């Protein structure tokens, strides 16, 4: 037996020394040196620094530029907004609490902070999904005589919201629960504690299956299809060097999209699983931090990949940033 238990938490440390205190109550400097709390903060800062500009600028530019306000772009705005919840709901909170060494805002604090940090990152995920689906529809033209309009874009977005609530809301009302995770400065879903009174075991799977594998598959299908369609059209049109580039560059991106997606959600799935399947096993509060380190940084690199690397968007930034000109 590895950790410490309390009504609304689980501390990854052995209170045999009698030093363990509630993370809602006192600094966990036994869990980790203070300077390591400092580095945690350093990070949270970083992600705020890069993440808030990049993502906010995305909304901003979409305002200065009429050419951005198209249906195929809605989901991308969803994506930035999501990231912003991830910043203000997660990153900044955790910067504050990390600096105390414990989750100062109590359990309600843990529920909110957990809920928005979680809501935010799921919208983002399902954005990335919905996105690939639209791109597949529009390009692989799977349904004949079908044109993608504003009214689809709207559902697209709504659907990410529903999907996301379908995961962030349960823990708030009994199926799984939110608890300071890691070094106990932030509050995640419970997926490592087998807490029968809330059925963590089940939710964990439902999470794993609906909120990981589905996405994973869909995304892989839709993009495969597309790197198919475009690789084919290229062959059938060798005479064109442009169509040659397109197909080449479209591949390069879909590889990225995918690689980058595993980097984000693999760690949580990898851990959730290994934990589920090694239930008699002790997991460090730093190591418990690893999966969440990856999942949070995507609030920086998803904007970069899906927005700054998007040809349309990029221009208007360079334009906006360099003062109306260029």
């Amino acid at each position: 037996m590895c950790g410490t238990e309390g009504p609304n938490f689980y501390v990854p440390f052995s209170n045999k020394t009698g030093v363990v205190r509630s993370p809602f109550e006192a600094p966990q400097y036994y869990l980790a040196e203070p300077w390591q709390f400092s580095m945690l903060a350093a990070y949270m800062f970083l992600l705020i620094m890069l993440g808030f500009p990049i993502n906010f600028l995305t909304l901003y530019v979409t305002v200065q530029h009429k050419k951005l306000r198209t249906p195929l772009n809605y989901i991308l705005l969803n994506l930035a907004v999501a990231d912003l919840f991830m910043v203000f709901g997660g990153f900044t909170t955790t910067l504050y609490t990390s600096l105390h060494g414990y989750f100062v805002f109590g359990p309600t604090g843990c529920n909110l902070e957990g809920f928005f940090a979680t809501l935010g990152g799921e919208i983002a995920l399902w954005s990335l999904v919905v996105l690939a689906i639209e791109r597949y529809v529009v390009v692989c033209k799977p349904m004949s005589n079908f044109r993608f309009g504003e009214n689809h874009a709207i559902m697209g977005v709504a659907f990410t919201w529903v999907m996301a609530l379908a995961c962030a809301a349960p823990p708030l009302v009994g199926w799984s629960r939110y608890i300071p995770e890691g070094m106990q400065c932030s509050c995640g879903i419970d997926y490592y504690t087998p807490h029968e009174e809330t059925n963590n075991e089940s939710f964990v799977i439902y999470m794993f299956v609906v909120h990981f594998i589905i996405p994973l598959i869909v995304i892989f299908f839709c993009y495969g299809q597309l790197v198919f369609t475009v690789k084919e059209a290229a062959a059938q049109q060798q005479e064109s060097a442009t169509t040659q580039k397109a197909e080449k560059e479209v591949t390069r991106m879909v590889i990225i999209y995918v690689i980058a997606f595993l980097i984000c959600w693999l760690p949580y799935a990898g851990v959730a699983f290994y934990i589920f399947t090694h239930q008699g096993s002790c997991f460090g509060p730093i190591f418990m931090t690893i999966p969440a380190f990856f999942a949070k940084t995507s609030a920086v690199y998803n904007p970069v990949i899906y927005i700054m690397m998007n040809k349309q968007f990029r221009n208007c930034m360079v334009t906006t940033l360099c003062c109306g000109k260029n």
Binding site: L72, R135, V138, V139, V230, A233, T243, A246, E249, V250
Partner: peptide, 11 residues
């Protein structure tokens, strides 16, 4: 396809 590719920002 290059038209739709553009609308998606993929090329």
């Amino acid at each position: 396809i290059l038209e739709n590719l553009k609308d998606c920002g993929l090329f």
